[PDB]
Amino acid sequence: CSLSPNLNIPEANYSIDNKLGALSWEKETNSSITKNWWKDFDDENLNKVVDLALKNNNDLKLAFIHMEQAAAQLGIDFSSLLPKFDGSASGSRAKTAINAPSNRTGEVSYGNDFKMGLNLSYEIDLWGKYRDTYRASKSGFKASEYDYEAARLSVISNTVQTYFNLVNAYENENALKEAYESAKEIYRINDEKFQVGAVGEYELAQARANLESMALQYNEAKLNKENYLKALKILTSNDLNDILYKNQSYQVFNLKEFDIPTGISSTILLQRPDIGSSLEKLTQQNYLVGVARTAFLPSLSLTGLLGFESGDLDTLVKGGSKTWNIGGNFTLPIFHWGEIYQNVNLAKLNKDEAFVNYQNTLITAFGEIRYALVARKTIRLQYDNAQASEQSYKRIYEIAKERYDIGEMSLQDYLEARQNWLNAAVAFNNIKYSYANSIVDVIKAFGGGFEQSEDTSKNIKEESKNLDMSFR
Amino acid sequence: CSLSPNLNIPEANYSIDNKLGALSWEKETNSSITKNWWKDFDDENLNKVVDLALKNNNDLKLAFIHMEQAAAQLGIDFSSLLPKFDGSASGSRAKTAINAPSNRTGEVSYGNDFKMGLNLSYEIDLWGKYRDTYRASKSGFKASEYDYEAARLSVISNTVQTYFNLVNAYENENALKEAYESAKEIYRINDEKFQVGAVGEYELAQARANLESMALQYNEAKLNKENYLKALKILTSNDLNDILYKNQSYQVFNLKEFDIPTGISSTILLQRPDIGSSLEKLTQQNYLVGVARTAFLPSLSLTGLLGFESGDLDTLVKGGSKTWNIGGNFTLPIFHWGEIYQNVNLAKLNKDEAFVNYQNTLITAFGEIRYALVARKTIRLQYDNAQASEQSYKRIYEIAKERYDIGEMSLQDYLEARQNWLNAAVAFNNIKYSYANSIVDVIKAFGGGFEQSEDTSKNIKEESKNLDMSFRE
Amino acid sequence: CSLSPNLNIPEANYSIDNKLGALSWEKETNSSITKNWWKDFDDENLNKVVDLALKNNNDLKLAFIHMEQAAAQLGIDFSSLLPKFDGSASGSRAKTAINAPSNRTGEVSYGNDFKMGLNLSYEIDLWGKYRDTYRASKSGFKASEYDYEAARLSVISNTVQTYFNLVNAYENENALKEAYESAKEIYRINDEKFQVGAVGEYELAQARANLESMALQYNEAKLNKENYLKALKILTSNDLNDILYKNQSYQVFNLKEFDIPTGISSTILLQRPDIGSSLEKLTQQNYLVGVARTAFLPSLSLTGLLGFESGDLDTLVKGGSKTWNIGGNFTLPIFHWGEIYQNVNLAKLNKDEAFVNYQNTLITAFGEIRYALVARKTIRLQYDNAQASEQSYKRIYEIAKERYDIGEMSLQDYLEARQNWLNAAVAFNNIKYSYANSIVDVIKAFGGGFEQSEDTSKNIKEESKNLDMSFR
Ligand SMILES: CCCCCCCCOCCOCCOCCOCCO
Ligand SMILES: CCCCCCCCOCCOCCOCCOCCO
Ligand SMILES: CCCCCCCCOCCOCCOCCOCCO
Ligand SMILES: CCCCCCCCOCCOCCOCCOCCO
Ligand SMILES: CCCCCCCCOCCOCCOCCOCCO
Ligand SMILES: CCCCCCCCOCCOCCOCCOCCO
Ligand SMILES: CCCCCCCCOCCOCCOCCOCCO
Ligand SMILES: CCCCCCCCOCCOCCOCCOCCO
Ligand SMILES: CCCCCCCCOCCOCCOCCOCCO
Ligand SMILES: CCCCCCCCOCCOCCOCCOCCO
Ligand SMILES: CCCCCCCCOCCOCCOCCOCCO
Ligand SMILES: CCCCCCCCOCCOCCOCCOCCO
Ligand SMILES: CCCCCCCCOCCOCCOCCOCCO
Ligand SMILES: CCCCCCCCOCCOCCOCCOCCO
C-alpha cells in the first residue's frame, strides 16, 4: 500500500468578466488561443525568426535536456521496484591464530576460501516506500514537461517581442535619418546666407546646434537598433558570422484585429504551463511525505545466493562445492529520539513549501492576466492618440515651413515645429510596437494555447521536431 | 570533546556622527525605531495593507517554513547524541557445501538460523563529531530566524513603498485627468471659432495636437497606475477576485517629521537581521570545521543485542535460545594519502567563504546606511524646491490664462505655460512620495526595530500571530 | 583503462574583419590587450581604486576560495587512486544460546573476542572509475581558475566603469551647481527690480520658477553622485569610516586614441576566460560519463589484515594471537532493470547540458563583441556631435545674455537659452564618459588580456599577491 497523505488542492474561486480587456466599441472575446499564434501578425520575417528560435535557442534545449534528465531519474527509481541480481567471485587466504575462538586445534591454522555465485537482493515494498519514490519522480517528470512548455512559450514570446522592438528601432532610426538629412540642408542654407550677410551669427548657431543635436539623436537611434539586433541574434542564431555581421529583414507592423481573450478563462488553471508544473511539483512532495513515513514501519528484506564454495580452487566447481541460501530480515525502529519524527516533519514542511510556491504561482498569474488585459485596451487607445498627435504636429510643421520660407516665421519657431513632429512620429512608433507586444503579453499570460488535458508527451515530440540536438 | 577552532570575529570600528543625515536646521536624532514604524504615517489604509501582507505574503510564508525546516534538521542532529534502539527478526536456510571450510562433517549440510531481539547502536562522541554537528544546526536555525526577520522587514518595506508608489500613480493620473479635460475644452472652443472663421487652421491644429498629447499622457498615467496596483495585489492579497477586479483605497501623504536616525547607530551590528544571520552562518561553518577534523581521531562504536537465536523456529523463544552480546569497536585512519587532510581544508575554506560573506554583508549594510541618510535629507530639500516650483509655475499659468482670454497671448505660449504647470505638479508628486519612501529606506537600513539581544523565538511567535498557515490546518 | 568517450568540440568557424569597429578615418587594429589596460587612461586616481578592488573586493575573494575548494576536492579524488590503511581494535562478550547453531556444547556458552591490527582496503581501478573521477575534478579545478580570471576581469571592469560613472556624476553636479548660482542671482536682480516696480509679477514668477527648478535639478545631481559614490565604496573599500564619510578624488576624462581591437580576434576562443571555463566544464562532464559506465563492469576489491585475535585479553598481543589475511573480491551486476543504464543516460545528459552551456557562452560572447565594437565607434561619432552642440548652445547663450542685458530679449527667452546650454553640457558629459566605458566594454569582451596558452596557475598566483586574505 501507500502512506502518502491525501492531496487537497483548494478550488480556485473567481468570477469571469469579458469586459475587463474590451473597450466599449470592442467585441467581448473568450475564444481560445491558436498554437501558432505568432503567424496572426501576417509577417513572414517574424515567422522565419521564430522558427530559428525553436531550432537554435539554447535555453529551449536546456529545458529539453532537463526533461530527459527527469525521465532518466524516473527509470532509475522504477528499477527499485524489482529484485536485483549480481554475480560475485572471491578468494582469500588467512593465518588463523591459535588464540582465535574459532580455532580448536591448539595450533596455527592456514586456510583458503573460494566463493562464486549469483546473488539476490530485494526490499519488499510493503508500505510503498519505493512505489511513492517512483511516483514522486513521475510527478517530477511531468513537471519538467510543463516546465519545457513554459520555456517554449517564454522563448517564442521573447523572440517576437525582441523582433518588434528591433523594428521599432529601425523605424526610429529611419525617422531620425531624414530629420538629420534636412538638418544638414537647413544649416547649409543658413551657412550660405551667412557668407553674404543674409543671416546673423545667432541664427547660424541655432541652425548648427540643430544639426549637431539631430546627429547626436541619430547615432543614439543607431545604437538602440544595434542593441535589439544583438538581442535577436542571441535568441535565434547558431551561425557565428550571422551573429557578427548580418542584419535582420523586417516588416512594418500595421494595426489589425486580433482574436485574443478579453477576459479571464474559466479553465485558466489548465491553460498555463507554469501552474501545471507547480501542481505536479506539489504532488511530488506529497508522495515524498509518504516515503518519509515508511521509516516508522518495519522493513522486509530478501537475500539469496546460488553458487559454489571450497577451501581449494581445483574443486570450486565440483558437486561437493555447490551451495545456496535464502533469508528474510525484519527490522523495526524502537527509539530514535525524534530522528524519524523530525524527518517526517521535514518532509511535511517540504510539501508546505511546494504548496506556498503553488499559491504564489497562482497569485502572480492572475496579476499578469489583469495587467495584460488592461494594458492591451489602454495602449489601443494610445494608438489613436499618438496617431492623431503625429498628424497634427505634421500639419503644424507644414504650415510652419510655408511661413518660414517667406520670412514670416523665425528659424527658432520653425526648428521647434520640426522637433515636435519628430517627437510625435517617434512616440507613435513606440506606441505602435508597444501595442504589438501588448498582444503577446495577453497571449503569454493565457498560456499561448497550452492545454493541460491534452497528451503532453505527444505534443512535445511533435513541436520539438526541428529542435537542433545534432550536437549530440 | 570538540575540535572546533576559536571563532575570532574582528571588531567593526567606525565613528558615529548624527549630522550625516540631518539638515542644518534639523535636530540630530539617534532615537531607536519602533517595531511598527509604518503607523507613524498616520494612514489607516496603509496599516490595513501591511496587515494583509503580514497575513498573506507567500515569501513571508516561505521564510517561516525555512525556519521550521531548520528546526526539524536541528531535531534530527540532536538525536545523534543518543543511543538508538531497534528491533530485529530474521530467518535463513542454507545448503553448506562439503568443500566449505566451515563444514567438518564431510557431507552436505542443510541448516537453519532464526534470530529475534532488541539492538543497541551508539556512537561514542569522544571528539564532538556529533556535538558540533548539532551546534552547527543550532547556528543554522538561529540564522533561519534572523533570515525570517530580514524577510519580514523586506516584505513590509516593499509593501509600504509599493503603496506610496501607487498613491503617487493615482495623483499623477488624477492631475493628468484634469489636464485632459480642460485640454478638450480648449479644443472645443477653438473648433467652434474655426467654423465661424475666428481662428486659423494653424491654431486649431495646435489645440488638437495638445488634446491628443494630453490624452496620450493620460493613458500612460493609467497604465503606470495599473502596474503598481498589480504589484500591491501580488504582495498582499489571497483573493483572486480582489486581484482581478478590485482597486485600492488610499490617503495622500502629508509632510510631517519622523523620529528616525540621522547618524549610524553604535549597535548597528545588533540591529540588522542580515548581519546576525550572516554571523550565525559563519559560526555554523566554524563548527563544521571541528566535525571534519574528528575524522583524524579514533571513533568508538557501541553495539548491544538482547534476544533469541535457534536452529529451529519452534524453540526460538525457549529458555535455551536466550542470548545477548555487547561490543565496542575502535577505528583509526593511518594513511589515506591526503583524503582526510583535504576534507579539513575544504571545511576550512567553507568557513572562509562564510567569513567573506559576512564582510560583504557588513560593507553593503554601511553603504546602504550612508545613501539612505544622505538621500533622506537631500530629498527633504527637494520637497521645498518642487513645492515652490509648482506654485510659481501655477501663478505663471494663472496670469497666462487671463492674458490669453483677452487675446494678449498666443495659444502656443498659453499651452506651454499650462504644460509647464502640469510638469511641475507631477514632479512635486514624484518628489513627495520619493521622500516617503526615503523614510522607509532609512528605517530599513537600520533594521526596522530589530534587536538581536532580545528573545528572537518569542518575538517571532508573537509577531507571526496572523500569518495565514491555514492551508495545512 | 578508461571508459570516457572521445570529446569532439566542433570548430568555431568565423571570418575576420578589422573594419567592424573602425571608423573610416581610424586605423584598423588587431593588436592584443595589455594585462593592465586601465593604466592607459593616464588616471592615477583610477589606478589606486583598481588596486583597492584587487585587494578588498569580496567577490574576487570568493572566486579565489572557489578555486581553492576545487583544489581541495582534487586532492580528495587523487587519494582514491591509492590503497588505504586503517587501524582497528574491538572487544565483544556474548552469551551464546544453547539452541544457537554454532553452539554444539549443549549448554550456555559465555565467550569473548578481542581484535587489533592494521587493515588494507583498495579498489583496483581497472576501468578508470577513480581515474576519470580524478580527471573530472582536475578539469573542474582548471574551470575554477578560468572562473577566477573571469571574476577578476569583471571586478576590474565594474570598478573602472563605476569610477567613470562617478566622475560623470561629479561633472554634472558641478555644472548644475553653477547653473543654480546664476539662477539665484537672476532671481535676486528681478526681486530687487520688482519692489521698485521695474519688473512685473509674471517675470518675477518666471525667475523664481527657474530658480526652484534649478535647485531641484541640482539636488538630483547630488543624489546621482552619492549613488555612484556608494557603488564605488562597496566595490573597493574595507574601511567602514571610509565607506561612511569619505569621498573620491578623481580626474576628468580627456579624449585620446586607444590601442584596442577594431575587429574580432582569430584566437578569441583562447582569449576569453568564460569560454575556457565552459570548455573545461564540458570535459569534466565527459570524464564523468566514463565513470558512470564503469558500473557495468566488474569491480575488484583488495582487503588485507595484519594483527591479533584472542578470546582472552591477557594474551591479545602474544605470539599465539598473531593473525593475517588477504583477499580479492569481484562483483558484477547482472540484472538491474535499467538502474545502471539510466544512470549512464543521466551522465550523458549532464554532458549535453554542459555542451549547450558552452554553445550559449560562444553565442553570447560573439554578440557582446559585435555590440562593443559598433558602440565604441558610434559613441566616438557622438563625442564630436555632443561637443559641437554644446559649443553652439553656449554661443547662443552668450549672444542671448548680451541682448537680455540691454532689454532686447524677454526673460524667458533668456532663461530658455540658459537651460539649453545646461542640457547640452550635461549631455556632452554623459557622452564623454559613456565613451570611456565603451572602451572598457571592448577590452572586457576581448578577455582583457587573458591568454589560455599561458601558465594559468603561475599568472593567477602573481596577480593575486595583493589580495587581502588576512582574516585567515
Ligand atoms: C602485483 C602482484 C601482487 C603480488 C603477487 C605476489 C606473488 C605471488 O606469490 C605466490 C606464492 O605462492 C605460494 C602460496 O602458498 C604457499 C604455501 O602454502 C601452499 C599450500 O600447499
Ligand atoms: C537441483 C537442485 C538445485 C541446485 C543445483 C544447482 C545446479 C548448479 O547451479 C550452480 C549455478 O551456479 C551459479 C554460479 O554463478 C557464477 C558466478 O559468476 C559471477 C562472476 O563474477
Ligand atoms: C540468486 C539465486 C538465489 C537462489 C536461492 C535459492 C534458495 C532455495 O531454497 C530452498 C529451501 O527451501 C526448502 C527446501 O529445502 C530442501 C530440503 O530437502 C532437500 C532434500 O534432501
Ligand atoms: C564463471 C564460471 C562459472 C562456472 C560454472 C560451472 C557449472 C558446472 O557445474 C557442474 C558441476 O557438477 C559436475 C560434477 O562434479 C562432480 C563432483 O563430485 C565430487 C564432489 O565434489
Ligand atoms: C535464479 C535461480 C534460482 C534457483 C534455485 C534453486 C533451488 C534449489 O533447490 C534445492 C532443493 O533441495 C535441495 C536438494 O536437492 C537435491 C539434492 O542433491 C542435489 C544437489 O544439487
Ligand atoms: C511467494 C512465496 C514464496 C515462494 C514459494 C515458497 C515455496 C514453498 O516451499 C515449501 C517447502 O519446503 C518445506 C521445508 O522443507 C524443509 C526440509 O527439511 C525437513 C526437515 O526439517
Ligand atoms: C538475563 C537477561 C534477561 C533476558 C530477557 C529476555 C527478553 C527478550 O527480549 C527480546 C525481544 O525481542 C524483540 C522482538 O523484535 C521485534 C521485531 O519486529 C517487530 C515486531 O513487532
Ligand atoms: C539493547 C540491549 C542490549 C543488551 C546488552 C547486554 C549486555 C550484558 O552483558 C554484560 C555483562 O558482562 C558480563 C557478565 O557476566 C558475568 C558472568 O556470568 C557467568 C555465570 O556463571
Ligand atoms: C533495554 C534492556 C537491556 C537489558 C540488559 C540486561 C542484560 C542482562 O545481563 C546479565 C548479565 O549476567 C547476569 C545473568 O547471568 C545469566 C543468567 O542466569 C544465571 C544463572 O541462573
Ligand atoms: C516473496 C516472499 C517470500 C518469503 C520468504 C521469506 C524468507 C525466509 O526464509 C527463511 C528460511 O525458511 C526456513 C524454512 O524452514 C523452517 C523450519 O524451522 C524449523 C526447523 O529447523
Ligand atoms: C515480540 C516478541 C517477544 C517475545 C518474548 C518472549 C518471552 C517469553 O519467554 C519465555 C521464557 O521461558 C520459556 C521456558 O523455556 C524453558 C525450556 O527451555 C529449554 C530449551 O529449549
Ligand atoms: C561508554 C563506554 C562503555 C564501555 C564499552 C566497552 C566495550 C564493550 O566490550 C565488551 C567486552 O568486555 C569484556 C570484558 O572482559 C574482558 C576480559 O578479558 C579476558 C580476561 O581473561
Ligand atoms: C556507563 C559505563 C559503562 C557501564 C559499566 C558497567 C560495569 C562493568 O563491569 C565490568 C567488570 O566485570 C568484568 C567481567 O565480569 C564477568 C566475567 O566473567 C568471567 C570471568 O572470567
Ligand atoms: C609475519 C607477521 C609478523 C607479525 C607482525 C605483527 C604486527 C601487528 O600489528 C598490529 C598493530 O595494531 C595496531 C592497532 O591500532 C589500534 C587502533 O586504534 C589506535 C588508537 O590509539
Ligand SMILES: CCCCCCCCOCCOCCOCCOCCO
Ligand atoms: C594492512 C596489511 C595487510 C597484510 C596482509 C598480509 C598477507 C599475507 O600474505 C601471505 C600469504 O601468502 C602465502 C604465505 O603462506 C606460506 C605458508 O607457510 C607456512 C609455514 O609453515
Ligand SMILES: CCCCCCCCOCCOCCOCCOCCO
Ligand atoms: C604491512 C605489511 C605487512 C607484511 C606482512 C607479511 C606477511 C607474512 O608472510 C606470510 C608467510 O607465511 C609463512 C608463515 O610464517 C611462519 C610463522 O612464523 C614463523 C614460525 O616458524
Ligand SMILES: CCCCCCCCOCCOCCOCCOCCO
Ligand atoms: C597502539 C598499540 C599497538 C600495539 C602493538 C603491539 C605489538 C607487539 O607485538 C608483540 C609480539 O611479540 C610476542 C612475544 O611473545 C610471544 C609469546 O608466544 C607464546 C604463545 O602465545
Ligand SMILES: CCCCCCCCOCCOCCOCCOCCO
Ligand atoms: C595488486 C594485486 C594483488 C593480488 C591479490 C589477489 C587476492 C589474494 O588472494 C589470495 C588467494 O590465496 C590463494 C592462493 O594460495 C593457494 C595455495 O595452494 C597451493 C596448493 O594447493
